[PDB]
Amino acid sequence: ADGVGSSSGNWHCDSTWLGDRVITTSTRTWALPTYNNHLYKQISNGTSGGSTNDNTYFGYSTPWGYFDFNRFHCHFSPRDWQRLINNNWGFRPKRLNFKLFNIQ
Amino acid sequence: ADGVGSSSGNWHCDSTWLGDRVITTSTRTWALPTYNNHLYKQISNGTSGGSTNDNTYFGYSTPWGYFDFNRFHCHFSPRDWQRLINNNWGFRPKRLNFKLFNIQVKEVTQNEGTKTIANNLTSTIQVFTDSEYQLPYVLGSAHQGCLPPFPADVFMIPQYGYLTLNNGAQAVGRSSFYCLEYFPSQMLRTGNNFEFSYQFEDVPFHSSYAHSQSLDRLMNPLIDQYLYYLSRTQTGGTAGTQQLLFSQAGPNNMSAQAKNWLPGPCYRQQRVSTTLSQNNNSNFAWTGATKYHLNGRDSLVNPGVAMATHKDDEERFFPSSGVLMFGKQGAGKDNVDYSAVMLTSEEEIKTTNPVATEQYGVVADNLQQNSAQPIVGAVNSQGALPGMVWQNRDVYLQGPIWAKIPHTDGNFHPSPLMGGFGLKHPPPQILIKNTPVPADPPTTFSQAKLASFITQYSTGQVSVEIEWELQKENSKRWNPEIQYTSNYYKSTNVDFAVNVDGTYSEPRPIGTRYLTRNL
Amino acid sequence: ADGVGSSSGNWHCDSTWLGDRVITTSTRTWALPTYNNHLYKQISNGTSGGSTNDNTYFGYSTPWGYFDFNRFHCHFSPRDWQRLINNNWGFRPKRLNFKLFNIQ
Amino acid sequence: ADGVGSSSGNWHCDSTWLGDRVITTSTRTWALPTYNNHLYKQISNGTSGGSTNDNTYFGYSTPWGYFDFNRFHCHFSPRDWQRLINNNWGFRPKRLNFKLFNIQVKEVTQNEGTKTIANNLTSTIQVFTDSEYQLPYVLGSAHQGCLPPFPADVFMIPQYGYLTLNNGAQAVGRSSFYCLEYFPSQMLRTGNNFEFSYQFEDVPFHSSYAHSQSLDRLMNPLIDQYLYYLSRTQTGGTAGTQQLLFSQAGPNNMSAQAKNWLPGPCYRQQRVSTTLSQNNNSNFAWTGATKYHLNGRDSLVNPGVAMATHKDDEERFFPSSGVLMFGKQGAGKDNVDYSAVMLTSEEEIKTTNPVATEQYGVVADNLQQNSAQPIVGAVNSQGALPGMVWQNRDVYLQGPIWAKIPHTDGNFHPSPLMGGFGLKHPPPQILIKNTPVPADPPTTFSQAKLASFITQYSTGQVSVEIEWELQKENSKRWNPEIQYTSNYYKSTNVDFAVNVDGTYSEPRPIGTRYLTRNL
Known part of the structure; x- marks a missing residue:
């Protein structure tokens, strides 16, 4: 069924409040550039050039990108965040589900 | 089976008449632009700038469009509307079926004044219906953007937007903001299609008929009443003395008979004549208008409570804002x-x-006594009294079908004042948007949201099907009833048809009230 | 089991929040005087004495007293009232239970 | 069977020793006054009036009283405490049983200096335990009002009250108010009784023993280490030159050996001598005290982290606030x-x-170089380091049994600093009150709350039973261990007994640590 003219996913964004748990789903549109012209490159900073010893580093930059949802406002709206903080003593994440679809 | 080279739907447009019901389906071609460059924007109007306090607002405009079929001419043809109104005492919508299919999404490229349109086969549109009635409901406001009355017209989908609380041009703490991407919606490519069904809640038949009697005439004309009224309070002569004399009202005096019922409520309005010389010389449109006052704002009552346009033998007069007004084809704003x-x-x-x-x-304005002559004042506005009976405003071929009854602690006779069927759970709003496709990003990371998009629009076909229940006409009347008729005499154009240049027009309003009943 | 030296009831005052409903129980201590020396008496007010026609009345006062809980603060605390009004679009009373006990 | 003329309980006071456990039950007679005239009252202390910022508070005093048995002498006798401490390495509470029975409620009448007490047979008391830990928990604060250590003493129930957030003498928005009549409670007349059971959560045995070794001496005294240390950094002679010489530390030098472990943490405190002339002449009690600083308030660390009172051959010195202090019978406030x-x-x-x-x-304060002589600074306060081991503070016959671990995101070694067993769900608070009985109301209705009540108090018996688990002493030591002993020599009074006037006293603190173990 995978094809050019049929969508591979739907837009699911909302929250649902059931008893002792809440399920917050959110959908976004992204754009991915080519990084580093498909190259790995080492990156470093030394003391030469007026930089401090404290800021020295050595590493690599990769052509890859990455998905990160580590901020609460990704998952919660301001109204949902208000329901959470006003009514509850505590919360913790139970489980996660991730999807990529409708790729151009 | 969803694919580029196979159609996802067919063209279904016609009506079928089965017994006590009729099913009218109609198909149109639409075009959806990108609105607001994929942005939400707040919109407001304050008093600054010469605008009136009455016209102030605060709200938001959304990138989303919406499908609206709220006018009867969407579903009915002029011939079908004639079958309905001539043969039936009443009708109501039973159920609904909606479809989107055969969707093309196209991209537009411009350089050097050259304009190129091409298919983008991997682009999507997003569609959701608001089933739980969680958004501001804008459909019952009689806006433009409905499906055309003529099936061969291609139409543009209107932009969605809503208003909320304001003080002047400013928001207040209660004023609310809605993101429509915070709803689950279905995403469709060219091979995908969309469908849902809806069932109307039980609603009273619209009354398509006129009364062959009037409240004040319900009596037997041949017989006297056994009751009495106060006929005469004074002796006749040169110097009269007070007395109480009583009479039984028969056919001779009908106005004085006792009656069980009262006419419907009124909210009085100003009389305008179509003959210009009879109208006052002044601009009384807004100033002499009938208005209601809500939170410091005055707003015209348009049309208002249902009241007769005019009495006998005056067709030149009409209430100022008190009747519906349709434009002829090509009329300006x-x-x-x-x-x-x-x-x-x-x-x-x-x-x-x-x-x-x-x-x-x-009504009486005072207490009477031998030193005080009676005074009787006029009642311009009358709320509901026990014993009132009234008719709702008529529905028209090009007029609104339904409205959403506001969600409130109380209402009185929740029939929409423009016309049609009041509904607590009306047909849901159908919201559609082109999914944004960004242009190439910078190749070095930036946190700013992407403002550069590929210009796109989408087209397709929309099909809507309503099942209507009919109330058959049981009348035992002997003489022939008035019908809606096409004029027999020759003309340059056919009514309800295209002209030489190819544009479709509706020459007149067609109401639904022709057959008659007794009170 | 009814006797002088055993209590005929317990003190139940609190609220419990279950799903789509809340149950608020409350207990108070009361005192009942003898009214009217065990008599019925007619009471009335006429226009004589400088009183207005609008305030005239005729009726009876009875030796009986009566229990009335018609104000919300009887049943709800200020914290419970806050949970109600912040989290809910509406409420209505379903059912009632009343008790008199531990009578001296 | 509940009635005026039949008792609702019996007097159970004794201990029974079964194998690895002991069950100590004790019964007392109590008296409960009416507190605050049946009123809640807010109490506060500000800086105005010469009081210190450190002593400011805000809270409420309640008409309720409470039962507290948090001291060991409630449950154990001095003979039972001796059996425990001499024969066992450790103990912990397993479970609890509580009873109220044989309740008298009495009314007091006064006129003309004549004072009459009589039974009111229809009055009630109210009792509830806070099982869900929904009230401020005041028990672990080492207050007065516990059951007496001597079973024949009749005691008064202490008034309940609590504190909350404040700024000075003023409340803040977060500061909370609790009505204890907003809890379901059981109402009892003279025939009624009250009971509940409680089970302690799993807690480590209190260690009743002393170590027969010290961390620094854990080595084999006969054998050298195979490791090395830096013995000498300079040649000996008139003019020395730097060098690095290394040695293996044997029995000859024990201080320089390598070790796996470190002593427990410290928070240093000031040394006071019981011989007065050795102490500085000044009032250093508060000023030279060891304190912690919380939201602008300084509070004494009493006793603080467990640290040895003194080193070898100095028994006259003790840390200022760093040890528990009990009064002798009849000591003032x-x-x-x-x-x-x-x-x-x-x-x-x-x-x-x-x-x-x-x-x-x-520890080293600097980097060493030929131009800079080494500098070594003193560590007065040390937090937890990997490799530390330590002992908790000892428990005493008259000291506190348990405390409630505060409900917080984190804690470290949550053993109470005064002593005993830290508990997340400790024994619940048991709250008791005389139900108010109003005097005759006015006979004409008044909305004001009734301020006139019959003066009443109540008495009865309280019984508490705890099951304690014992950890038997497995030691293979040859020579006889130190025991707790009564002095053999003659005296005017017996220790832990009543005197001529009839008052019971505890002559000394009795700790639990006598038997020994190896590290």
């Missing part, structure tokens, strides 16, 4: 002459309904 | 001489625990 508008007429209801311009009646 | 107090001693833990007055150790 602003300051259009009387010739381009089409006024409707409610005169069919003058049997039970007070006339819009005239008073309701007169 | 304020400014009491050293003779009436009884100081405890933690010296048993000087094996693993740094001494309270002395430093933890010394």
